[PDB]
RNA sequence: GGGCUACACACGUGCUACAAUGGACAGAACAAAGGGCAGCGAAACCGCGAGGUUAAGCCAAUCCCACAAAUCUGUUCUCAGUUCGGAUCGCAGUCUGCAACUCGACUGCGUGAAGCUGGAAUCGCUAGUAAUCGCGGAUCAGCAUGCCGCGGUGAAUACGUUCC
C-alpha cells in the first residue's frame, strides 16, 4: 500500500465494530477479500470467499498488515501424476 | 557473379602503412576503433621497452613469418573427408596470419593484453609460439597429403 | 578472528574486506568509512592499533551476523505459522514475489529431471 | 612431564582492545586477544549491545 | 470474486551475464527523430533514493518531456565464482488506481542462485550490412527484456558453383 492508509470497503468496519461492542457473533462470510486486517478486528473468524467455497479463517495477533484474503489460496494443488 | 571490388583501408598515421590499419580492423571488438588504437600504441610502446628494436621491423618479420605457404581444403568426394592442399593467396596469407595471430594472442592468459600481444608478435619474430606452431601444423597437413591435389582436383 | 565481523579476509582493501561481513554491504561500507575518514587505506590490512578499535565500535553498532540470520529465520517462521500464503510460497518451491511458473524459475526448482511423454 | 615434547610455558600476558588484561601462562610471552568476558555482552550483565530483542513483535504497526 | 499468470516438465522466442579491449569511481565530450493541453511540466525547495511540495513556460523550429549512451581522460582492483555477474528472498519506502493478496511498476537497505563462453545440432548478415551503445513512440490510469522507429560507434570475407 502507500499512506493514509490501508483501505477496507468500510462495511466490514461497521460490522466488526458492532460485533466488537456487543453480541460477539462468530463466523461470517465476506466477498471483499481486499480489506486489510485491523487491531479492532482481532480474534474474529471470517469465511473467506475464494470463489469455489468459503474458507474460514481465525485471526491471530500476529496478522494485521497481511491482506485478509491472502490467507486462503484459490489455487488447487498440485496437481501432478507420479509423486515419489 | 565474378570477382567483387574491395575497398582499400584508410592508412594509419602511425606507422604510416595500411597493414597496421588492417590490424586496427582485426584486433577491434565491439566496433571500437579507439580501443584498438590504445592497444596498438601501447603495443608499440611495450615493444619499445623490452629488447630494443624498431617495431615496424619486428612486425614485418613477424607477419612474413606467420603466412602459410599452402593450405588444405576439405571436400567429401566419397567416404570420409579429403583435404586438398593449394598455394595460398597473399591476401588470404596475411588474413590467416593476422587472424591466428590475434586469436592465439587472446588466449595467452597474461594480465595485460598489450604485453601478451607483444609476447606473441615476438614469438612470431622468433619462429615460435602458438601461431608459428599452427602454421607449422598447416604445413604438416599440407605437403604430406598434397598428392591428391597434385594436378587433379 | 576477527575483531568486528567475524572472519574478514586478508590482503584486500578494507572496504571490500568488510563488505564480506554478513550485514554491511557496499554503500553501508561507504558510510561507515565516511565516518572513518580512512581514505583507503589500506589495500592489505594495516589500519591503526586504536583506529581499528574505534571502527570496531561503529561496526559493533551495526548488527549482526548469525543473529541477523536469526532475524530472517524468525521472520519466515513468523510467515509460516501466521497461516499462511507467503511462507507457503517459501516452501512450495514456488517463487514468492509473484513471477509465474510455466517456464524458468529454476532458482528453487533445481535442474533435473523429467517424467512425462506424449504420445 | 616428558622432556622436549612439551613446549615451554612462559608467563602469559593476555590483552584486549578494551585494554583489559589477564595474567596466565602460555608458550608465547604475550597474547593479544580480540574478545574477553569483561567485554562480551552476555557475560557483562544484560547490556543492550545491539538488541533490544522483540522490537517490535508481534505487532506495533500503526501510523495515524 | 476468481481465472485467463496454474506447475512435476518439454519446446519456441528475447533479455542479462559468465569479466581486465574489463569492473568501480571522478572529470570531460558528440546526436537524431518523436511526443505534449483531461498534457508536457522547467526552475526553486524537501527526501540517500523513488518521488513529493510548489510553480514559470508551452497548442509548441519559442517552452517542456531531456540528461544522450558507448567513447575519451585519469584514479583504483590484478585474474578469482572475483570490487565478475546479478538471481532469489527479507525489511523499509514510493508512483498510478475505489482498490496493488491473488496478479503492477519503481526505489532504499539487506541477502549474493546458477553461470569462468556451452554436446549433437542450428540461425542471421556482402558496407553503413553484420557487431554493439543509448533515445523516442504506438500501446497506455498504472504496467514494454515485446513491437515499431531514431541516431552514435562501426568491421571481417566473398577463391567459387564441387557440395546442401
Curated annotation (Swiss-Prot), chain A:
Superkingdom of this protein's organism: Bacteria
TM helices/strands, residue ranges: none
Keyword field: Ribonucleoprotein, Ribosomal protein, RNA-binding, rRNA-binding
rRNA-binding is among the record's keywords: yes
The keyword Phosphoprotein is assigned to this record: no
GO terms for biological process, alphabetical: ribosomal small subunit assembly; translation
GO cellular component terms, A-Z: cytoplasm; small ribosomal subunit
GO molecular function, one term: rRNA binding
Summary of the function given for this chain in its UniProt record: Protein S19 forms a complex with S13 that binds strongly to the 16S ribosomal RNA.
HAMAP family noted in UniProt: Ribosomal_uS19 (MF_00531)
Similarity comment: family membership: Belongs to the universal ribosomal protein uS19 family.
Subunit structure: Part of the 30S ribosomal subunit.
Protein name: Small ribosomal subunit protein uS19
Gene that specifies this protein: rpsS
From Swiss-Prot, chain B:
Disulphide-bridged cysteine pairs: none
Lineage, broadest ranks: Bacteria, Bacillati, Bacillota, Bacilli, Bacillales
Database matches in Pfam families: Ribosomal_S7
GO molecular function: mRNA binding; rRNA binding; structural constituent of ribosome; tRNA binding
Family the entry assigns: Belongs to the universal ribosomal protein uS7 family.
Protein name as annotated: Small ribosomal subunit protein uS7
Keyword Ribonucleoprotein: yes
General function of this protein: One of the primary rRNA binding proteins, it binds directly to 16S rRNA where it nucleates assembly of the head domain of the 30S subunit. Is located at the subunit interface close to the decoding center, probably blocks exit of the E-site tRNA.
Keywords: Ribonucleoprotein, Ribosomal protein, RNA-binding, rRNA-binding, tRNA-binding
GO BP annotation list: ribosomal small subunit assembly; translation
NCBIfam families per UniProt: rpsG_bact
GO CC annotations, alphabetized: cytosolic small ribosomal subunit; ribosome
HAMAP family reported for this sequence: Ribosomal_uS7_B
Gene: rpsG
Subunit structure: Part of the 30S ribosomal subunit. Contacts proteins S9 and S11. Interacts with VmlR.
Keyword Cell wall biogenesis/degradation annotated: no
Curated annotation (Swiss-Prot), chain C:
Disulfide bonds: none
Full protein name: Small ribosomal subunit protein uS13
Record-linked InterPro entries: Rbsml_uS13_C, Ribosomal_uS13, Ribosomal_uS13-like_H2TH, Ribosomal_uS13_bac-type, Ribosomal_uS13_CS
NCBIfam families associated with the record: uS13_bact (TIGR03631)
Keywords assigned by UniProt, alphabetized: Ribonucleoprotein, Ribosomal protein, RNA-binding, rRNA-binding, tRNA-binding
Database matches in PROSITE patterns: RIBOSOMAL_S13_1, RIBOSOMAL_S13_2
GO molecular function, one term: tRNA binding
GO cellular component, one term: small ribosomal subunit
Function: Located at the top of the head of the 30S subunit, it contacts several helices of the 16S rRNA. In the 70S ribosome it contacts the 23S rRNA (bridge B1a) and protein L5 of the 50S subunit (bridge B1b), connecting the 2 subunits; these bridges are implicated in subunit movement. Contacts the tRNAs in the A and P-sites.
Gene3D superfamilies: 1.10.8.50, 30s ribosomal protein s13, domain 2
UniProtKB/Swiss-Prot annotation, chain D:
InterPro entries: Ribosomal_bL28/bL31-like_sf, Ribosomal_bL31, Ribosomal_bL31_A, Ribosomal_bL31_sf
The keyword Aminoacyl-tRNA synthetase is annotated on this UniProt entry: no
GO MF annotations, alphabetized: metal ion binding; rRNA binding; structural constituent of ribosome
A Gene Ontology biological process term: translation
Superkingdom of origin organism: Bacteria
UniProt xrefs under SUPFAM superfamilies: L28p-like
Cofactor: Zn(2+)
UniProt keyword annotations, A-Z: Metal-binding, Ribonucleoprotein, Ribosomal protein, RNA-binding, rRNA-binding, Zinc
Outcome of mutating residue 36 to A: The protein does not accumulate and cells grow very slowly
GO CC terms: ribonucleoprotein complex; ribosome
Residues noted as binding Zn(2+) in the record, renumbered to the chain: 16, 18, 36, 39
Keyword NAD: no
Upregulating conditions: Only accumulates during exponential growth.
Cofactor note: Binds 1 zinc ion per subunit. This zinc stabilizes the protein.
Pfam families to which the protein is assigned, alphabetical: Ribosomal_L31
Family note: Belongs to the bacterial ribosomal protein bL31 family. Type A subfamily.
Function: Binds the 23S rRNA.
Quaternary assembly: Part of the 50S ribosomal subunit during exponential growth.
HAMAP family xref list: Ribosomal_bL31_1
Protein known as: Large ribosomal subunit protein bL31
Organism field: Bacillus subtilis (strain 168)
Gene name of the record: rpmE
Amino acid at each position: 500500500s502507500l499512506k493514509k492508509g490501508p483501505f477496507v470497503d468500510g462495511h466490514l468496519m461497521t460490522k466488526i465494530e458492532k460485533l466488537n461492542e456487543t453480541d460477539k457473533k462468530q463466523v461470517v462470510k465476506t466477498w471483499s477479500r481486499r480489506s486489510t486486517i485491523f487491531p479492532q478486528f482481532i480474534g474474529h473468524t471470517i469465511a473467506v470467499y475464494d470463489g469455489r467455497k468459503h474458507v474460514p479463517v481465525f485471526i491471530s495477533e500476529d496478522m494485521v498488515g497481511h491482506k485478509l484474503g491472502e490467507f486462503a489460496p484459490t489455487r488447487t494443488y498440485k496437481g501432478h501424476a507420479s509423486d515419489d | 557473379k565474378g570477382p567483387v571490388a574491395k575497398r582499400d583501408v584508410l592508412p594509419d598515421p602511425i606507422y604510416n602503412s595500411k597493414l597496421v590499419s588492417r590490424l586496427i580492423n582485426k584486433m577491434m571488438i565491439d566496433g571500437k576503433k579507439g580501443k584498438s588504437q590504445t592497444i596498438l600504441y601501447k603495443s608499440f610502446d611495450i615493444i619499445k621497452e623490452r629488447t630494443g628494436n624498431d617495431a615496424m621491423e619486428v612486425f614485418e618479420q613477424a607477419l612474413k613469418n606467420i603466412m602459410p605457404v599452402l593450405e588444405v581444403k576439405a571436400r567429401r568426394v566419397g567416404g570420409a573427408n579429403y583435404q586438398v592442399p593449394v598455394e595460398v593467396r597473399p591476401e588470404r596469407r596475411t588474413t590467416l596470419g593476422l587472424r591466428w595471430l590475434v586469436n592465439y594472442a587472446r588466449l595467452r592468459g597474461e594480465k595485460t593484453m598489450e604485453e601478451r600481444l607483444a609476447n606473441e608478435i615476438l614469438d612470431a619474430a622468433n619462429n615460435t609460439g602458438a601461431a608459428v606452431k599452427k602454421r607449422e601444423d598447416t604445413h604438416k597437413m599440407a605437403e604430406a597429403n598434397k598428392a591428391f591435389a597434385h594436378y587433379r582436383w | 578472528a576477527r575483531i568486528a565481523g567475524v572472519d574478514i579476509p586478508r590482503d584486500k582493501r578494507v572496504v571490500i574486506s568488510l563488505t564480506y561481513i554478513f550485514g554491511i554491504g557496499r554503500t553501508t561500507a561507504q558510510q561507515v568509512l565516511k565516518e572513518a575518514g580512512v581514505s583507503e587505506d589500506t589495500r592489505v590490512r594495516d589500519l591503526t592499533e586504536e583506529e581499528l578499535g574505534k571502527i570496531r565500535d561503529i561496526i559493533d553498532k551495526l548488527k549482526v551476523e548469525g543473529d541477523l540470520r536469526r532475524e530472517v529465520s524468525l521472520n519466515i517462521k513468523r510467515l509460516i505459522e501466521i497461516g499462511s500464503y507467503r511462507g507457503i510460497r517459501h516452501r512450495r518451491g514456488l517463487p514468492v514475489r509473484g513471477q509465474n511458473s510455466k517456464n524458468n524459475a529454476r532458482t528453487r526448482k533445481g535442474p533435473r529431471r523429467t517424467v512425462a511423454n506424449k504420445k | 612431564m616428558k622432556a622436549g615434547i612439551h613446549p615451554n610455558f612462559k608467563k602469559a600476558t593476555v590483552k584486549c582492545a578494551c585494554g583489559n588484561e589477564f595474567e596466565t601462562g602460555s608458550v608465547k610471552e604475550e597474547v593479544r586477544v580480540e574478545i574477553c568476558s569483561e567485554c562480551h555482552p552476555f557475560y557483562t550483565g544484560r547490556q543492550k549491545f545491539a538488541s533490544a530483542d522483540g522490537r517490535v513483535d508481534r505487532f506495533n504497526k500503526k501510523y495515524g
